Design a protein around this motif. Structure first.
Motif, PDB file in Angstrom:
ATOM      1  N   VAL A  35       6.305  20.194  11.712  1.00 24.81           N
ATOM      2  CA  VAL A  35       5.776  18.442  13.104  1.00 24.81           C
ATOM      3  C   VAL A  35       7.127  18.040  13.687  1.00 24.81           C
ATOM      4  O   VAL A  35       7.037  16.773  14.457  1.00 24.81           O
ATOM      5  CB  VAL A  35       4.629  18.372  12.855  1.00 24.81           C
ATOM      6  CG1 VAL A  35       2.955  18.626  12.096  1.00 24.81           C
ATOM      7  CG2 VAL A  35       4.802  17.217  11.335  1.00 24.81           C
ATOM      8  N   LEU A  38       9.851  19.132  15.946  1.00 26.10           N
ATOM      9  CA  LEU A  38       8.494  18.888  17.905  1.00 26.10           C
ATOM     10  C   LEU A  38       8.575  17.818  18.088  1.00 26.10           C
ATOM     11  O   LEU A  38       8.996  17.070  19.029  1.00 26.10           O
ATOM     12  CB  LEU A  38       6.749  19.008  16.858  1.00 26.10           C
ATOM     13  CG  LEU A  38       6.704  20.830  17.633  1.00 26.10           C
ATOM     14  CD1 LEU A  38       5.443  21.328  16.335  1.00 26.10           C
ATOM     15  CD2 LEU A  38       7.148  21.716  18.762  1.00 26.10           C
ATOM     16  N   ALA A  39       7.880  16.960  17.306  1.00 20.10           N
ATOM     17  CA  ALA A  39       8.572  15.197  17.786  1.00 20.10           C
ATOM     18  C   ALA A  39       9.558  15.192  18.053  1.00 20.10           C
ATOM     19  O   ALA A  39      10.431  13.890  19.432  1.00 20.10           O
ATOM     20  CB  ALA A  39       8.195  14.227  16.624  1.00 20.10           C
ATOM     21  N   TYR A  57       3.853  19.116  22.832  1.00 14.27           N
ATOM     22  CA  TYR A  57       2.378  18.537  22.601  1.00 14.27           C
ATOM     23  C   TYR A  57       1.706  19.029  22.641  1.00 14.27           C
ATOM     24  O   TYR A  57       1.613  18.529  21.220  1.00 14.27           O
ATOM     25  CB  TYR A  57       2.554  17.033  23.533  1.00 14.27           C
ATOM     26  CG  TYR A  57       3.206  15.817  24.193  1.00 14.27           C
ATOM     27  CD1 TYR A  57       2.714  14.431  22.792  1.00 14.27           C
ATOM     28  CD2 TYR A  57       4.392  15.779  24.586  1.00 14.27           C
ATOM     29  CE1 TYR A  57       3.891  13.721  22.081  1.00 14.27           C
ATOM     30  CE2 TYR A  57       4.850  13.968  24.660  1.00 14.27           C
ATOM     31  CZ  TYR A  57       4.452  13.377  23.360  1.00 14.27           C
ATOM     32  OH  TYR A  57       5.277  12.063  23.304  1.00 14.27           O
ATOM     33  N   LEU A  60       2.573  20.041  18.611  1.00 14.00           N
ATOM     34  CA  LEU A  60       2.940  19.207  17.339  1.00 14.00           C
ATOM     35  C   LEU A  60       0.778  19.107  17.634  1.00 14.00           C
ATOM     36  O   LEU A  60       1.898  18.651  16.187  1.00 14.00           O
ATOM     37  CB  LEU A  60       3.195  18.174  18.563  1.00 14.00           C
ATOM     38  CG  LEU A  60       3.632  16.495  17.629  1.00 14.00           C
ATOM     39  CD1 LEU A  60       4.541  17.076  16.382  1.00 14.00           C
ATOM     40  CD2 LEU A  60       3.915  16.081  18.543  1.00 14.00           C
ATOM     41  N   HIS A  61      -0.107  18.910  17.811  1.00 14.32           N
ATOM     42  CA  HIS A  61      -1.638  18.807  17.537  1.00 14.32           C
ATOM     43  C   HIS A  61      -1.405  19.443  16.890  1.00 14.32           C
ATOM     44  O   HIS A  61      -2.295  19.399  15.668  1.00 14.32           O
ATOM     45  CB  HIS A  61      -2.645  18.201  19.033  1.00 14.32           C
ATOM     46  CG  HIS A  61      -3.712  18.682  18.778  1.00 14.32           C
ATOM     47  ND1 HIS A  61      -3.437  17.456  18.050  1.00 14.32           N
ATOM     48  CD2 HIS A  61      -4.386  19.265  18.842  1.00 14.32           C
ATOM     49  CE1 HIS A  61      -5.324  16.826  17.393  1.00 14.32           C
ATOM     50  NE2 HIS A  61      -5.334  18.716  18.241  1.00 14.32           N
ATOM     51  N   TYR A  63       0.324  21.750  15.285  1.00 15.42           N
ATOM     52  CA  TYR A  63       0.833  21.786  13.686  1.00 15.42           C
ATOM     53  C   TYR A  63       0.564  20.794  13.034  1.00 15.42           C
ATOM     54  O   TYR A  63      -0.382  20.310  11.498  1.00 15.42           O
ATOM     55  CB  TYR A  63       2.182  22.041  13.792  1.00 15.42           C
ATOM     56  CG  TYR A  63       1.983  23.436  13.624  1.00 15.42           C
ATOM     57  CD1 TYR A  63       2.897  24.256  12.658  1.00 15.42           C
ATOM     58  CD2 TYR A  63       1.934  24.191  14.756  1.00 15.42           C
ATOM     59  CE1 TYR A  63       2.933  25.557  13.115  1.00 15.42           C
ATOM     60  CE2 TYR A  63       2.287  25.535  15.368  1.00 15.42           C
ATOM     61  CZ  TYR A  63       2.744  26.178  14.319  1.00 15.42           C
ATOM     62  OH  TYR A  63       2.740  27.654  14.271  1.00 15.42           O
TER      63      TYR A  63
ATOM     64  N   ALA B  32       5.489  11.035  13.400  1.00 10.23           N
ATOM     65  CA  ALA B  32       5.745  11.871  12.681  1.00 10.23           C
ATOM     66  C   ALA B  32       6.801  12.526  11.491  1.00 10.23           C
ATOM     67  O   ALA B  32       6.806  12.694  10.282  1.00 10.23           O
ATOM     68  CB  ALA B  32       6.144  12.751  13.683  1.00 10.23           C
ATOM     69  N   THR B  71      -2.177  12.302  18.105  1.00 13.72           N
ATOM     70  CA  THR B  71      -1.805  13.489  19.360  1.00 13.72           C
ATOM     71  C   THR B  71      -2.904  14.452  20.719  1.00 13.72           C
ATOM     72  O   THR B  71      -3.270  14.404  21.528  1.00 13.72           O
ATOM     73  CB  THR B  71      -1.112  14.904  18.654  1.00 13.72           C
ATOM     74  OG1 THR B  71      -1.514  15.276  17.662  1.00 13.72           O
ATOM     75  CG2 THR B  71      -0.114  14.401  18.274  1.00 13.72           C
TER      76      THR B  71
END
Lengths: 80, 80, 80, 80, 80, 80, 80, 80
Positions: A35, A38-39, A57, A60-61, A63, B32, B71
């Motif tokens: 995460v 990704l961010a 995104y 990210l959500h 995970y 994050a 997210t």
């Protein structure tokens, strides 16, 4: 609005996928790393991409959900 | 088993707490970072603490939930 | 096989997209970091995903192409 | 202008040189790091040097070319 | 064998070049960074280049000499 | 003013000390790391120490000299 | 054996010295970094030096004492 | 005000707890990193939390005390 994360044994069910946890403490570590990665990628890309990937995104959500589920499973395990 | 995250306007409701979002993209970045910092601290402490704080895993779970909610809110916003 | 990168002034043309450079020294650092981060993210996701999203491999290649074009512009400019 | 990168199997052919890839995942990370480091070194040397050695700009471009070729091989392989 | 570094006022004379120091404490910082960057680049390149640039080792020696001279000049200044 | 570094076989003689080289490439790497670490520590300490240790600048100078000597020895070796 | 740290308001008194804190959050981070850097420098110097300068061990302990005092002030303040 | 740290052989006694050191060089580095990470985590949580959990401040102080004791043991040992 609601977000619902379903947990069955060692498996997270969300968004038409199953995510199996095999080594909880290590999985939690790895999921937190993902995460973060990704961010941070989204942040770096935002300098060039006027609209950063919906794909990133979405991941990210996804995970974040797995991290939230995995951490819940661990806390449940410790309380038992 | 289920985990339920409730969202009303800009507020995540979970675990008898409210978490208010102010700038989704910035909050996602910060959240994050926090979950990463928690996970990495847990990892480093595990070398010296036979049981690493339940406190730290509680925080990690809480902030994971907030990240999962934030997210989701962002994706919803982009689709609208 | 052959890869062709088209450069018109400060713009790279590749794979249905155009990419404009504005500060070569900074853009080269930033693009290298993005490529590194994408590669590392793919590696980490591969722990859990049989198939990592094709979009990530596409982005990786795209940004590496922009970086190759940027470094070309950088040396041409230096020799001038 | 046009940049052409020739790829024969796992070898990149460019600028009087041949470069063989052996572990794409690792090579991509390593090459990105090298490109970043070269760019940062040029930046730092520029504080003191009116003219930074052309060899550094040449290396920078060369390694960026190898990286672009490597990422191409990576996505082709993934799609296969 | 001998290595001789000549110092005149704020200028280092070595290897047919003059290197002028304007802000000693900051210059020392920057020079240490440059030698580190050179050494680390050489290390990373050694994975791919069967013989790493004589150019990079030439620069590393040159900047090590400047660091050695700059630090001497500072210590001399402090003792006065 | 002059600074003189004396070299006999694998030994640098300077400041009433001998510094023996064992593996030039490894020693160069280690010496570069040490001077960087000294410089960065000096920088960080400068926020709290009105006069940062003469000890630290003495060490930085000493190790800079060893790096300058080691790098010279390496270049000499490669030319032979 | 016993270590005693004296605290007068925002000042630490130890080993013939006084140390004044001004921003506990920042000072704690900075002091931890200094301690880490000193410890790592001692480690690296110990590769080459049979005896690393006593001053470095003294600085290491000193800064660790200030950090212990600073963290005490931080929690006292938080509880108030 | 006064802080007292008790040391019995390789054990630190403080705040209802005992802490045993085993490799001073490594423990000092690891403890400094833990202290830094706790301080940074408190900083980041303070963005969102009016009150950061007292436990984090307690852990921060505890580990800083162990670090102060460890560095004392390190210099005592070095002098012997």
């Amino acid at each position: 609005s609601k977000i619902t994360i379903n947990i069955k044994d060692n498996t997270i069910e969300y968004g038409h996928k199953e995510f199996v946890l095999s080594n909880l403490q290590e999985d939690i570590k790895n999921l937190a790393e993902i995460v973060y990665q990704l961010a941070k990628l989204i942040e770096k890309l935002s300098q060039y991409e006027e609209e950063v990937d919906t794909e990133l995104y979405n991941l990210l959500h996804e995970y974040a959900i797995y991290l939230a589920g995995a951490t819940s499973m661990f806390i449940d395990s410790e309380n038992k």
